């Protein structure tokens, strides 16, 4: 053998998990490895599985994770660190724009996040673009299918005039029991 390349560690559907909401931590190494270990950093806590389904996010599960795998006698280097965040722990802040939310191309704007608590840190997130796929079958689902789906109904009379989107549907892929 050469050296064991480090696996990837992902949170599905994301590392930003609201309280009481499910998330999968997936450690992926190369095929046919002997053992996976998930390690929560600044703790004595671990699991010896590639896939860990967390049925409900809690404050006590938030933090830093890495995984490594074993093959014969050798251990991989660890994954890049995963920062697993519990959201919805405190009431929402306000986001505003100065001067305002419309601004000319080439100009300058500043977004202000303000909170009615003492809190000293802030993160700003920009929504990613939605990805496309009556009946939409999905066969041999994986943790990669976990997430928020919306559907549009239109008439082929006007194929670019669409409904408001459906209320969101949260699809949750629980752990394999096999």
């Amino acid at each position, epitope marked *: 053998s050469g050296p064991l390349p480090k696996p990837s560690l992902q949170a599905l559907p994301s590392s930003l998990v609201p309280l009481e909401k499910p998330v999968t931590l997936r450690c992926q190494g190369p095929p046919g490895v002997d053992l996976y270990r998930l390690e929560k950093l600044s*703790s004595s*806590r671990y699991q010896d599985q590639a896939v860990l389904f967390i*049925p409900a996010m809690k404050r006590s599960l938030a933090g830093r994770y890495r995984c490594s795998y074993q093959q014969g006698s050798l251990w991989s280097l660890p994954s890049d660190q995963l920062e697993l965040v519990a959201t919805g722990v405190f009431a929402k802040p306000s986001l505003s724009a100065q001067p305002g939310p419309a601004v000319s191309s080439g100009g300058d704007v500043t977004l202000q996040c303000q909170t009615r608590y003492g809190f000293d840190q802030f993160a700003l997130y920009k929504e990613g673009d939605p990805a496309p796929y009556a009946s939409f079958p999905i066969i041999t689902v994986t943790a990669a299918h976990s997430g928020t789906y919306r559907c549009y109904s239109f008439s082929s009379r006007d194929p670019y005039l669409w409904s408001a989107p459906s209320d969101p549907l949260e699809l949750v892929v629980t752990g394999d029991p096999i």
Partner: nanobody
Amino acid sequence: QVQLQESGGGLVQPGGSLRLSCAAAGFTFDYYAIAWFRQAPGKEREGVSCISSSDGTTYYADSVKGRFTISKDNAKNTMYLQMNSLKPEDTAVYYCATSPLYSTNDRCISEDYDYWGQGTQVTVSS
């Protein structure tokens, strides 16, 4: 969301016994750390018993060793505390606790458990 459904508790004579249980739902106990904690009136929350790992090793607080048994029926999705030879100092709110993560800690600390019973009152009265 998860369930720890609580069974048992109440009023018992010194030297008597009772069984606390929690029935899981939304998960199974197979690959989960399990623990009982208690909070007596005016005292801090105390670990009473845990199995935090697949090595089988159980921890028991000095004050309950030989009287209290923690156990688990994976098929019934239930964890148990068998409490024998009850003293007045056993009077407390008892909490089942569980985690999808194992721990190497030699002792039950509350930061190692993510899912908690609301509380089961146990009162030792003469």
